[PDB]
Design a protein around this ligand. Structure first.
Ligand SMILES: [Mg+2]
Ligand SMILES: [Mg+2]
Ligand SMILES: [Mg+2]
Ligand SMILES: [Mg+2]
Ligand SMILES: [Mg+2]
Ligand SMILES: [Mg+2]
Ligand SMILES: [Mg+2]
Ligand SMILES: [Mg+2]
Ligand SMILES: [Mg+2]
Ligand SMILES: [Mg+2]
Ligand SMILES: [Mg+2]
Ligand SMILES: [Mg+2]
Ligand SMILES: [Mg+2]
Ligand SMILES: [Mg+2]
Ligand SMILES: [Mg+2]
Ligand SMILES: [Mg+2]
Ligand SMILES: [Mg+2]
Ligand SMILES: [Mg+2]
Ligand SMILES: [Mg+2]
Ligand SMILES: [Mg+2]
Ligand SMILES: [Mg+2]
Ligand SMILES: [Mg+2]
Ligand SMILES: [Mg+2]
Ligand SMILES: [Mg+2]
Ligand SMILES: [Mg+2]
Ligand SMILES: [Mg+2]
Ligand SMILES: [Mg+2]
Ligand SMILES: [Mg+2]
Ligand SMILES: [Mg+2]
Ligand SMILES: [Mg+2]
Ligand SMILES: [Mg+2]
Ligand SMILES: [Mg+2]
Ligand SMILES: [Mg+2]
Ligand SMILES: [Zn+2]
Lengths: 110, 154, 47, 116, 101, 53, 142
RNA sequence: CCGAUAGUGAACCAGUACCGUGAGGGAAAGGUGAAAAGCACCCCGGAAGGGGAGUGAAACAGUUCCUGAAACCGUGUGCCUACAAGUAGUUAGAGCCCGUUAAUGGGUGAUAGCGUGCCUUUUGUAGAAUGAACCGGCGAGUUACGAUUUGUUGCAAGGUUAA
RNA sequence: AUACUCGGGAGUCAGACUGCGAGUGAUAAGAUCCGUAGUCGAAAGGGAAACAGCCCAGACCACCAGUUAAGGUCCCCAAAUA
RNA sequence: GGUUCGUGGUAGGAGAGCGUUCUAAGGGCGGUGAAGUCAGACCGGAAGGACUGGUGGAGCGCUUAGAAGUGAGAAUGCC
């Protein structure tokens, strides 16, 4: 019926992935891929590979029609955070969260 | 306690100005790996009631067993050689089929060995009869010779 | 040994202070408020 | 023997947070503000079990007043009339007649007028 | 036809076949209960009480003897370390009205 | 200088009502048959949709 | 339990027309507030609005006892520094009587969302002619 | 007696790493499965990572992998919400949506009444006094020996042993 | 319907305002210091808009019953346009 | 078992209890699913306690007594 792909622990902040994933949620996969191609954000290429993986899964594992697919679900979940430090003035160090994302895309017929 | 925990000698940071709670040692009891505030210390829990109360207690537990018909007095009890099979057969003949304290005087070393591997059964001298050993056991089996020795003391 | 009843009145549960306000001995734990007698190790010598 | 603080704490705090179901934001999630919200809800509910009794008597009286003024009586005269006439019907029952059986209410208002 | 009866320190309006909840009455679940204090009878001939209609009675059969849904009563005084929690379940009798007389 | 109170989830989410991207301005080409930004050259065909290069 | 509660659109709201000619500004207003609120109906429910619509005509002839015509001041503040404007009840009865009666009745309505709905049911006219004939308004006496 | 914030500082290559010129200070960090049977092969992808297929009792046990709470972050949507002035509830209450440990039930809440958090400290604090970002864990009248008093039990002009 | 005695266990030793009687002060102070009564402190409820200390009055729990207190009864707002 | 008078409360005195870990004895549950965890409209005057279902995958209640590292929301607490 539907096909999912996930990109786990991608080194991009979830907020930055979500602002893009919100454009493709509900679109036909052809339009979704165009939207990602012409959205100049660092998340666009990453989300494109998850979406094209989901479509390949739908065509190979579940013999679905790639011409009739819609993005049923798309969401970003928090992955494990890398903890870093930036030296600041007066010997003080400030925390830096190098956040990671789990990016899920589900495609379905209609 | 906070004195016995490794390290912890220095004040972790100055009393005033850092904006942190004032702290005296990293082994103060509210610190993660810190000293325990009271907690167990090695001590004896032993105490004896007066002798007269201890004698009344053994007299009363033994009288209870007679009232409950849980005391079996045996003429002899002896075994030619240490044999658990024989001791087990004996307990069926006497009709125990419960935990039982066996009290014996006429040395009979073969009784202790023969009953050593049975789970609910304890064999004791007679000199060694105690309130807690009688209480821990349902039936009390005692040889005539042992009864004499118990009455000789009480 | 499964039906032990110590003589009635011979044993009493100890009072534990500083275990909440319901007990009536919570917070200040029977010491009232401040002064020398509220402090750990507090109190003047006997006479 | 050591007693670690296992489970009793979580069980107690979770009950308080469940009593704060429906409260806004942090108030239905976090033990510290949920516990305040639940204590305060119980205090209001205790106060409002008393206030409810006052509120409903004010409602009934206002409805009896309206129905009685349609019979050229004020509430103060009608109630005096019913007392003199020896009629013990309470304000909740009068207010019910004034809305649901006005003919019956009018019969009582006549009994009141007669006694005045 | 409906009556107004005095039960449990309160007044209630009753028609036949109605199911009312009142303060606990003596009565097993079969038992027939007779309300003698009728304040008013309605329907095409309003019998009014001064204060009770002589001879007028409502009969009902006890359907349930129950305890209402659990109420928690909780008081506290801020800053005085005073809290008091108490459970409450008010007993009631569920009657079906049989006949206004 | 500093927040007097932490910002609630609701208030944070209301503030972000306008923090979003717009869809790109694109349409299907005739010669290519695939999507392209208007007023841009189409790489699928490999030139400007109209003007050949 | 069993106490009746009016539902929205359950109780028939009627249109009343009230001549203001001579009546003290209050006295008219206090009676009208009660009609708008629905305090004269046994169906009165405090949270619903069971009241009637009121047209006041001849508001220019409204009564002001004593020296109220010159001495009763109505104040407005714009919320700009020193932005306090004042009008006498007299001047307002001459030029803006619809405003005078609205101010007087607004003050006697509940100060809440429902009070603001009740105010919308009041129609004040300086003269004797309204344009609400379609609503078949019935004359009401105080 | 402890059972991984406990118990040693140290269950693990710990007096290590790290800090300090130095004396010295001094951590964190346990758990795949019975067995590696540790995922052939196919597919998308540069890889990572996925989806199948297979192994297995289980893979939502997949090389840090028993369980997996809360804060916190999201997706979906039953009810409400853009004329309202809100310690956020509570009491009354339509409407709409449900259907339970079956109960004078559950969710939501137009509108109406009432309503200044918790703690500490104070004569008095909603306080424009103090403390707490939140969640979790840990975190404070104990033990020994004496004194005294009450209760209990044994014996009683006696009672009791210490080493 | 309590007193007293003997034992065990306390807390308290910053008080506040109001009325009355005094001093200090200016016959000032929400001032200060005594005496005397009350309330608060440690008291929720009603009134005094709001308002520890004023007026009324003491909350064991439930009720969609009733009668009263101070204070009120044209509207906000229950009750007299008595 | 009735009658009568009571039942606001800080410091504080007095009483009765709930729950936690461990021990003993008795009696049980548990791969036909233990503890834990999640959910629920159930029960008790309170502390609290069940039941049903999901998850979990091997231990745990109950009764009576005993012993305590026995209950946290605040310490500019510690991690
Ligand atoms: Mg530097
Ligand atoms: Mg030291
Ligand atoms: Mg700070
Ligand atoms: Mg330690
Ligand atoms: Mg106790
Ligand atoms: Mg106390
Ligand atoms: Mg506290
Ligand atoms: Mg203190
Ligand atoms: Mg003191
Ligand atoms: Mg350790
Ligand atoms: Mg652990
Ligand atoms: Mg350590
Ligand atoms: Mg992992
Ligand atoms: Mg609107
Ligand atoms: Mg407006
Ligand atoms: Mg702070
Ligand atoms: Mg002693
Ligand atoms: Mg005085
Ligand atoms: Mg003074
Ligand atoms: Mg004080
Ligand atoms: Mg008061
Ligand atoms: Mg008030
Ligand atoms: Mg106060
Ligand atoms: Mg009353
Ligand atoms: Mg009266
Ligand atoms: Mg009125
Ligand atoms: Mg009382
Ligand atoms: Mg009390
Ligand atoms: Mg005590
Ligand atoms: Mg356990
Ligand atoms: Mg768990
Ligand atoms: Mg502890
Ligand atoms: Mg904390
Ligand atoms: Zn083209």
């Amino acid at each position: 019926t539907s096909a999912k792909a996930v990109a786990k622990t991608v080194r991009i902040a979830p907020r930055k992935a979500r602002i893009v994933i919100d454009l493709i949620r509900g679109k036909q996969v052809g339009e979704a891929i165009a939207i990602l191609k012409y959205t100049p954000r660092s998340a666009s290429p990453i989300i494109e590979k998850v979406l094209k993986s989901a479509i390949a899964n739908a065509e190979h594992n579940y013999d679905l029609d790639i011409n009739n697919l819609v993005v049923e679900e798309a969401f970003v979940d928090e992955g494990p955070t890398l903890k870093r430090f930036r030296p600041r003035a007066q010997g003080r160090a400030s925390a830096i969260n190098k956040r990671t994302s789990h990016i899920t895309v589900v495609v379905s017929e209609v | 306690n906070r004195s016995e925990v490794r390290g912890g000698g220095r004040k972790p940071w100055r009393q005033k100005g850092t904006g942190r709670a004032r702290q005296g040692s990293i082994r103060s009891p509210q610190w993660r790996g810190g000293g325990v505030v009271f907690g167990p210390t090695p001590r004896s829990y032993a105490y004896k009631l007066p002798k007269k109360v201890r004698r009344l207690a053994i007299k009363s537990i033994l009288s209870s067993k007679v009232n409950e018909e849980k005391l079996v007095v045996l003429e002899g009890l002896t075994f030619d050689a240490p044999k658990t099979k024989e001791f087990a057969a004996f307990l069926k003949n006497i009709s125990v089929d419960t935990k039982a304290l066996i009290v014996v005087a006429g040395e009979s070393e073969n009784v202790e060995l023969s009953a050593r591997n049975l789970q609910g059964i304890t064999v004791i001298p007679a000199e060694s009869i105690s309130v807690l050993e009688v209480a821990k056991h349902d039936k009390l089996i005692i040889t005539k010779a042992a009864v004499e020795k118990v009455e000789e003391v009480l | 040994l499964h039906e032990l009843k110590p003589s009635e009145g011979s044993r009493k549960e100890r009072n534990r202070v500083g275990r909440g306000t319901g007990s009536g001995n919570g917070k200040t734990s029977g010491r009232g408020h401040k002064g020398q007698k509220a402090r750990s190790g507090g109190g003047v010598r006997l006479g | 023997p050591r007693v670690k603080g296992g489970t009793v704490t979580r069980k107690r705090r979770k009950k308080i947070v469940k009593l704060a179901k429906g409260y806004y934001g942090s108030k239905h999630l976090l033990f510290k503000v949920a516990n305040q919200a639940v204590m305060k809800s119980y205090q209001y509910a205790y106060r409002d079990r008393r206030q409810k009794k006052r509120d409903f008597r004010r409602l009934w009286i206002a409805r009896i007043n309206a129905a009685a003024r349609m019979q050229d009586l004020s509430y103060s005269k009608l109630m005096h009339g019913l007392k003199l006439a020896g009629i013990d019907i309470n304000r909740k029952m009068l207010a019910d007649l004034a809305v649901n059986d006005i003919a019956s209410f009018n019969t009582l208002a006549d009994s009141a007028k007669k006694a005045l | 036809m409906y009556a107004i009866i005095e039960t449990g320190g309160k007044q209630i309006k009753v028609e036949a076949g109605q199911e009312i909840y009142v303060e606990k009455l003596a009565g097993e679940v079969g038992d027939v209960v007779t309300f003698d204090k009728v304040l008013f009878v309605g329907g095409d001939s309003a019998k009014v009480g001064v204060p009770f209609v002589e001879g007028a009675t409502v009969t009902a059969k006890v359907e349930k003897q129950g305890r209402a849904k659990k109420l928690t009563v909780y008081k506290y005084k801020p800053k005085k370390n005073y809290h008091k929690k108490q459970g409450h379940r008010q007993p009631y009798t569920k009657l079906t009205i049989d006949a206004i007389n | 200088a500093v927040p007097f109170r932490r910002t609630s989830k609701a208030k944070k989410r209301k503030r972000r009502t306008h923090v979003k991207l717009q869809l790109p301005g694109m349409n299907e080409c005739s010669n290519c048959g695939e999507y392209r930004l208007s007023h841009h050259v189409c790489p699928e065909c490999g030139q400007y949709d109209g003007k050949d290069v | 339990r069993t106490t009746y509660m009016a539902k929205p659109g359950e109780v028939e709201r009627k249109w009343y027309v009230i001549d203001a000619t001579g009546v003290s500004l209050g006295r008219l207003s206090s009676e009208v507030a009660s009609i708008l609120r629905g305090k004269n109906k046994p169906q009165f429910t405090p949270h619903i609005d069971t009241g009637d619509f009121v047209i006041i005509i001849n508001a220019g002839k409204i009564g002001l006892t004593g020296k109220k015509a010159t001495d009763k001041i109505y104040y407005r503040h714009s919320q700009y520094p020193g932005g306090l404007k004042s009008r006498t009840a007299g001047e307002m009865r001459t030029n803006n009587p619809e405003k005078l009666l609205e101010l007087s009745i607004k003050g006697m309505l509940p100060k809440n969302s429902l009070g603001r709905q009740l105010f919308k049911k009041l129609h004040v006219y300086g003269g004797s002619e309204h344009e609400h004939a379609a609503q078949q308004p019935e004359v009401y006496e105080l």
